């Protein structure tokens, strides 16, 4: 979820994860991705 994404050092996006990161889970009722 968003809170855990941010606490773990990731950020939520509705587009692709930046090339230097990879998906770690989801955010925002599952509609975004957590990237780190």
UniProtKB/Swiss-Prot annotation:
GO cellular component: extracellular exosome; extracellular region; extracellular space; Golgi lumen; membrane; microvesicle; sperm midpiece
GO molecular function per UniProt: CCR6 chemokine receptor binding; identical protein binding
Localization per Swiss-Prot or TrEMBL: Secreted; Membrane
Intrachain S-S bonds: 5-34, 12-27, 17-35
Tissues expressed in: Blood plasma. Sperm. Highly expressed in the lower head and midpiece of sperm. Significantly reduced levels found in the sperms of asthenozoospermia and leukocytospermia patients (at protein level).
Keyword Glycosyltransferase: no
GO biological process: antibacterial humoral response; antimicrobial humoral immune response mediated by antimicrobial peptide; calcium-mediated signaling; chemotaxis; defense response to bacterium; defense response to Gram-negative bacterium; defense response to Gram-positive bacterium; G protein-coupled receptor signaling pathway
Domain of life: Eukaryota
Keyword annotations of the record: Antibiotic, Antimicrobial, Defensin, Disulfide bond, Membrane, Secreted, Signal
Family: Belongs to the beta-defensin family.
Function of the molecule: Has bactericidal activity. May act as a ligand for C-C chemokine receptor CCR6. Positively regulates the sperm motility and bactericidal activity in a CCR6-dependent manner. Binds to CCR6 and triggers Ca2+ mobilization in the sperm which is important for its motility.
Subunit structure: Monomer. Homodimer.
Name listed for the protein in its UniProt record: Beta-defensin 1
Originating gene: DEFB1
Stretch of the intact protein here: 33 to 68 of 68
């Amino acid at each position: 979820d968003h809170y855990n994404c941010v606490s773990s050092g990731g950020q939520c996006l509705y587009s692709a994860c930046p090339i230097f990161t990879r998906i770690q889970g989801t955010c925002y009722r599952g509609r975004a991705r957590c990237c780190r």
